[PDB]
Amino acid sequence: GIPCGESCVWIPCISSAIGCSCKSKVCYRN
């Protein structure tokens, strides 16, 4: 429920194993 820092407009933050969810083209966590 808190922004991670990077966006996922083009590249999703999945193949990085950061543990963030792509939402509103931006990565969020907890």
Curated annotation (Swiss-Prot):
InterPro entries: Cyclotide (IPR005535), Cyclotide_bracelet_CS (IPR012323), Cyclotide_sf (IPR036146). This is a cyclic peptide. SUPFAM superfamilies: Cyclotides. Expressed in leaves, petals, petioles, roots and runners (at protein level). Keywords: Cytolysis, Disulfide bond, Hemolysis, Knottin, Plant defense. There is a cross-link at G1-N30 (Cyclopeptide (Gly-Asn)). Disulfide bonds join C4-C20, C8-C22, C13-C27. GO terms for biological process: defense response; killing of cells of another organism. It comes from the Eukaryota. The keyword Disulfide bond applies. Belongs to the cyclotide family. Bracelet subfamily. Probably participates in a plant defense mechanism. Has strong cytotoxic activity against a variety of drug-resistant and drug-sensitive human tumor cell lines, and against primary chronic lymphocytic leukemia and ovarian carcinoma cells. Has weaker cytotoxic activity against normal lymphocytes. Has hemolytic activity. The presence of a 'disulfide through disulfide knot' structurally defines this protein as a knottin. This is Cycloviolacin-O2. The lineage of its organism: Eukaryota, Viridiplantae, Streptophyta, Embryophyta, Tracheophyta.
